Write a protein that binds this ligand. Sequence first.
Ligand SMILES: O=C(O)CCC(=O)C(=O)O
Ligand SMILES: O=C(O)CCC(=O)C(=O)O
Ligand SMILES: [Fe+2]
Ligand SMILES: [Fe+2]
Ligand code: NA
Ligand code: NA
Lengths: 282, 282
Amino acid sequence: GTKRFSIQSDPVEIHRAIVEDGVAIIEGFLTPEQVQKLNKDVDAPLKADREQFWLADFIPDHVARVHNLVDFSHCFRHEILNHELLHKICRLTFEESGDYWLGYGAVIENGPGTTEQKWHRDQPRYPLVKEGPDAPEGMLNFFTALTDFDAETGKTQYILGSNKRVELGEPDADHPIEYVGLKPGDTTIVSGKITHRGSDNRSDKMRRAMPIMIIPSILTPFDATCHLSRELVETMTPLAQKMICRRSVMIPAKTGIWCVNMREAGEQIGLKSNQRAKEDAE
Amino acid sequence: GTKRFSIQSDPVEIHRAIVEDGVAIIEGFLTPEQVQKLNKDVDAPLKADREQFWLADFIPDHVARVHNLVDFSHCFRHEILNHELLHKICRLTFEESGDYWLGYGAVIENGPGTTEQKWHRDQPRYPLVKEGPDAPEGMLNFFTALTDFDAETGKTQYILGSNKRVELGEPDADHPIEYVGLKPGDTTIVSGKITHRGSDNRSDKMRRAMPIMIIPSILTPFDATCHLSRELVETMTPLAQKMICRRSVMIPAKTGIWCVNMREAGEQIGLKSNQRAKEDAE
Ligand SMILES: O=C(O)CCC(=O)C(=O)O
Ligand SMILES: O=C(O)CCC(=O)C(=O)O
Ligand SMILES: [Fe+2]
Ligand SMILES: [Fe+2]
Ligand code: NA
Ligand code: NA
């Protein structure tokens, strides 16, 4: 089944598993303290969403979602966006296309009563973008548990082998379903090629996942970042600024795009980095 | 040869010419007054560039370039980005991919001594993006003359028929070179599929072109717009804001991406539009 790694594992082997299998698990990708911070950051927005074409209008019964985590989560913008293993894996995964950045960071909360989904792949279908077993990787979703994913709350089902297929496919003897159990802070790295579906939540608990969707930076993210203040952006590392569309990005020809004066976008406007954040201060 | 249209021509016929031929000309696409304003806006930056990997470091001998025209040209951000015929043509051209936005707006000034270029296509090659005679359109460059393009200053050469070829190709009897003459304000609409090269500038004059490069909004622009102030952005029309990555954009599934709270990016932050500009005021 799906290879399970730790935070100390070789990114080369994690990348190999993603290429071969379409999916890999990192146990303890986040620490329990990080999980705690992230849950506290999204408690109020999730409660507000729940208490209520745009994709906001297509959220399934009993599911609440909150997007644009950079806007309001200190942990997300400083810890998650600088996650060293995430970056080692993404650099290898997207090497053919060049740099990568954040397609979106969100939390999805499946409440009791959430129903099993249809088989799908995560990658949007665009006429201009190559897709399929032999295409370059178009996305990686570090699908991170913030609560337990078990038999009751729902384990995501992956059709092993489906990353090699053109059609979504059905499980057979040689492509059985794996139901992936996760402890909070474990992540399943989901390629755009692997067929999967979430399960029923038939427990009494909220089941929360934080997709960290990474895409090649030649493609537009789902979550906009253009409204973020220069103040907030300047508290971030240069790497994390690059993940939110505030720095130039490299393409193989490497040369830069997303530029100012045909040069690096941040440097040309004097963009600072690593400045102290108001929320860390008294 | 290349079909020549006017500002009153049917966009359906212009689009047909782009699909069939890979190139179309609109005479009087800009008015002489617009040409005058644009030239005055770029005079100082061009002089500064001339008086001197990133593409800034690969500009050919005797050529000066200035990018990011939205930042400093009132005419560009209010007149060009709202050009009604440009939009009718782009909506038809990019219908398979959804919405479109500004890949870059620049002025290229070929001084006396500028040499004929190598045959090329304008569209960057990315492993993930389909290219070729049968691929969806990946870019349209409204290559707009700001000075005369004639035998002396240099007419751009297009290999007629090359949009149907996989390789760049060479002119033959059935794919002859067309040298396109332009008066200031005439535009050649250049698809990403047509093989072409600029000519020598063997005159005593500066030869200026303003590429208005439009790309599907699923793709990242060459010119960043993330540093523009909310003040400046709020002076623009909602359409022009969309061209500079400040509004959500539609994809066929239509649904929106580049979102805030999975909804329209500007509306969610209360983005104003059509506000009076400081440079129009006393
Ligand atoms: O896997 C899940 O439980 C839901 C995440 C997912 O598959 C999706 O919503 O696209
Ligand atoms: O056509 C020209 O004269 C120069 C514009 C062009 O072809 C290019 O620089 O890519
Ligand atoms: Fe999924
Ligand atoms: Fe060109
Ligand atoms: Na693979
Ligand atoms: Na065509």
